[PDB]
């Protein structure tokens, strides 16, 4: 290209990446209640996860997409609805429950002909940037007699969960296969830190291996070139 | 590369004992080639993506000794001659004299622009051997550090991580 | 000095000597092309290894130049040559050092060899005596200098003194200087340059026993002029 | 021309063609010493033999200048070079003379080899091939030029015609013309010359049977550029 | 000599979705035009047939484009 | 058409030994129909399309030997009148005076028009055979052009390629 615009932040980052898919076979062992919840993690993807690691505060609006299939690529005449549980309302335990009657969430009648439906959720997080690992207590006592289980715990840092299910009283006869593309339309940068260099171990803990590696050994004299 | 030498990476010595030799040739500046260009966080940024060009400078600061004094020098390579065979053939193409009580005067010459190994390097050379009296060690530390100018552009964003 | 991408340092608070004050001029007779691009970068000439022991060094000009270095590959093209020189000589020291060295320029410097015996028979100086190249040789017996001229009498000419107490290095500036504006490039020895110490170099043990001497030049007026040939 | 010591006569009522009448135009991007007193004399390329059996010559630049000349051995320094072209083709024929040469510069002339069989399996030219030095070879095949390039189509370019009736010499000016301002100088060809007569030479027993013809080029626009590597 | 790592515009990637085969056979036809052109550097418009894509080298027996003129002559 | 005497095509020669005679008709200037127009560059650039109509002119520069003289003749022939049987057949239609000391005089005279084999063709005939001196060749070469007028232009755009 020769202008400028093209090659500017948002199409540098404006890109539908991979995030999961969402197993519902026709019988299993994970969700055999015809239906499953996924909670939204940014960090159990690495690809993202690296690339949200440049930055720890940011501000940005979220919008999703339920791309869904048979293993073979075929649809069929089934009626889905797409339907979000908000924090405060708990997740959905069992086929009857409660959970599944927010009337909050409006709900559109399409068929499988209609491409995927486009949902948007704005930043709806108390605090005014994403943490994921929190330093501190959260108690806001001078209890510290007690083991204290709480460091590294935040019960209020749940951004919510997505509750897809299959629509009647009749069980599923297809088995389906859901793939979910995700991207952020506007970053801005408050704190920097250190992007990562070595592997993360788990997803909840910064910690790490014992045995530490180097990034490359190619150069093997600094006299070669 | 042993687990058991990682300590002393981040900086390297300097020796009395060589005279008028080499030190070590600064590898050639290409952000996306492994080495050390990828442990830099300006290495880390162009790892996503496909081209760069542009005309880098390396600067240096000197931390020798309080009475220490010698004369260092510093000469670049255009791109496509080989590495320069000795003292003198780097001395005949493009020189820059660095002294150690002037810290920041080094700048960017370029060597000569044509109309038309890929790329070249800059190295450094010996000129004097470091010299200290009696009661003063006879090895330092040097640091080497770089940055970015603002000729320094991509065109093309794409997803491509090799790591891990 | 900031000229395009050089960035140097250096100290104007000292003695800058001209000969004589006067810059070259130029020739208007009858009887009978300057890049500076590539040619422009400072050259550092090899290091020489002042010692206690070292006795100094000696060097033709321009006849170490014709062809060891970028001047040289430059001027044998061009059959004539003609540029101002920037000495350059620098004292690095602790306060643990002593020493007093006695830098000079002597136009038309002969060079006389050995000749011993009763009788007066001499041959002409071969190849290597002649120019030994970049290797140099040191003087066996500086106080008359291997070539009869004792020192008691290089004050003669301008000259300065060098005492590293307060400069940390010096700059000379000698013009283009000659009796015929038009003369042989390759055939006359225009000057020679000596570095004679006064004090030896004198230090406890435990410092660095070879202090390490720069010397470095500069094209002032660059201008090779003639004809191919 | 009178400039300096050079006097030479040339004809100014002739047929000056200039591409696409456009000077070359200076870059002014960030992706990253002319001497002309002994270049600038004028060089005469040695004569080719033209005659009844001649086929034709060509020539690559600046391949064939890379070594050869003294724009070859001023070019060995610099790593980039570029300059204009002064093409100068002169017919000298008598009254009895008969031929018309066909003279055309082409952008991008790509060379092709030799390949027979029935199935495709080619090789990489070899040194002599790719650059045969001043020595050239005569096209075997010009009908196609032995590139597979036939000759009806080479008017597509701008070209101009060579009737040695009124002219006596044909001075042609071709500026630097490239797609890219800051390009390679030993790898990349910007073009090549082709000579291809159109009506063979034709003369009755008794006159000369070849006819000295003289190419001669100077640098319009000497600009070595480039940094020493 | 002659090869480019640089110059590969990219490629397409067309996969059948989901976890499962596909259980139907399938033909695919891509229509191509040009939308802006411009002209820069002219070349002669080519008469022999090409033998190969990567390389422009030709046969060894060239032909010619028409013959159908028995005689000057004649029209 | 054989492979051993593919090289002179591309020129033609004269010859002395013909007296007022004629050397060749130039075909019609059809530059659809295959022959020489598809040899042409604007002929190619026909082969893609379907109609064409305008009136052509045939340029000829002289080239024979520094001495030669004479006149040479050249007429055209209007469309659907069949080809002049004789020279005098083609003198007695529109003629135009072609000298061999002037080069480019000749220019595009209509013949008649009337309102309303298919199309005409321009032929040349011997009017003076060429007579050089003693000492002097008795054959020269000559070469022939066409370009394209204003009036010249297509209505109608179809992908159409017959070779290969």
Same mark, same amino acid.
């Given at each position: 290209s020769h202008s400028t615009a093209e090659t500017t932040l948002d199409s540098f980052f404006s890109r539908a990446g991979l995030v999961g898919e969402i197993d519902l076979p026709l019988e299993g062992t994970t969700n055999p209640n015809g239906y499953a919840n996924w909670d939204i993690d940014i960090?159990?993807?690495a690809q993202m996860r690296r690339k949200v690691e440049l930055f720890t505060y940011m501000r940005f609006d979220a919008e999703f997409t339920f791309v869904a299939c048979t293993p073979t690529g075929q649809v069929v005449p089934q009626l889905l609805q797409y339907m979000f549980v908000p924090p405060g309302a708990p997740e959905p335990d069992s086929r009857e429950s409660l959970a599944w009657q927010t009337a909050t969430n409006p709900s559109v009648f399409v068929k499988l002909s209609d491409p995927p439906a486009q949902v948007s959720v704005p930043?709806?997080?108390?605090?005014?940037a994403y943490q994921w690992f929190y330093d501190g207590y959260p108690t806001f006592g001078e209890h510290k007699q007690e083991k204290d289980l709480e460091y590294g715990a935040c019960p209020n840092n749940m951004m919510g969960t997505f509750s897809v299910r299959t629509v009647g009283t009749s069980k599923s006869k297809y088995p389906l296969v859901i793939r979910i593309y995700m991207r952020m339309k506007h970053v801005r940068a408050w704190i920097p830190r250190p992007m990562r260099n070595q592997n993360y171990l788990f997803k909840a803990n910064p910690n790490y291996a014992g045995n530490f590696i180097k990034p490359t050994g190619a150069s093997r004299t600094a006299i070669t070139t | 590369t042993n687990a058991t030498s990682l300590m002393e990476r981040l900086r390297f010595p300097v020796s009395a004992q060589a005279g008028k030799g080499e030190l070590c040739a600064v590898f050639?500046?290409? *952000? +996306?080639?492994? +080495? *050390?260009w990828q442990s830099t966080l300006l290495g880390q940024l162009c790892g996503y993506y496909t081209q760069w060009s542009g005309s880098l400078e390396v600067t240096f600061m000197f931390t020798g000794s309080f009475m220490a004094t010698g004369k260092m020098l510093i000469a670049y390579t255009p791109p496509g001659g080989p590495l320069p065979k000795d003292r003198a053939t780097a001395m005949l193409g493009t020189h820059v004299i660095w002294d150690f009580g002037l810290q920041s005067s080094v700048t960017l010459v370029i060597p000569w622009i044509s109309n038309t190994y890929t790329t070249g390097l800059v190295s450094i050379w010996y000129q004097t051997n470091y010299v200290v009296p009696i009661g003063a060690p006879n090895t330092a530390y040097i640091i080497a550090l770089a940055a970015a100018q603002k000729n320094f552009t991509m065109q093309l964003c794409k997803d491509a991580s090799d790591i891990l | 000095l900031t000229i395009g991408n050089s960035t140097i340092t250096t100290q104007e608070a000292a003695n800058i000597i001209v000969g004589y004050g006067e810059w070259p001029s130029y020739c208007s007779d009858s009887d009978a092309t300057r890049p500076d691009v590539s040619v422009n970068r400072f050259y550092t000439l090899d290091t020489k290894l002042?010692?206690?022991?070292s006795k100094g060094w000696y060097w033709k000009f321009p006849d170490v130049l014709t062809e060891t270095g970028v001047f040289g590959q430059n001027a044998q093209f061009h059959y004539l040559y003609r540029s101002g020189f920037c000495i350059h000589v620098q004292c690095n020291a602790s306060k643990f050092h002593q020493g007093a060295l006695l830098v000079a320029v002597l136009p038309e410097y002969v060079i006389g060899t050995v000749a011993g015996g009763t009788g007066t028979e001499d041959s002409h100086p071969p190849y290597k005596q002649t120019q030994p190249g970049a290797d140099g040789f040191e003087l066996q017996?500086?106080? $008359? %200098?291997?070539?009869?001229?004792?020192?008691?009498? %290089?004050? $003669?000419?301008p000259h300065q003194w060098i005492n590293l107490r307060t400069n940390n290095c010096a700059t000379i500036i000698v013009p283009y200087?000659?009796? %015929?504006?038009?003369d042989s490039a390759l055939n006359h020895c225009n000057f020679g340059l000596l570095v004679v110490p006064i004090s030896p170099l004198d230090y406890d043990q435990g410092a660095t026993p070879v202090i390490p001497i720069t010397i470095t030049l500069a094209p002032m007026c660059s201008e090779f002029a003639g004809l191919r040939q």
């Open positions: 960090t159990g993807y930043f709806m997080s108390p605090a005014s | 050639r500046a290409d *952000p +996306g080639r492994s +080495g *050390p | 002042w010692e206690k022991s017996h500086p106080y $008359v %200098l291997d070539a009869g001229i004792p020192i008691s009498q %290089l004050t $003669v000419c200087i000659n009796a %015929l504006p038009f």
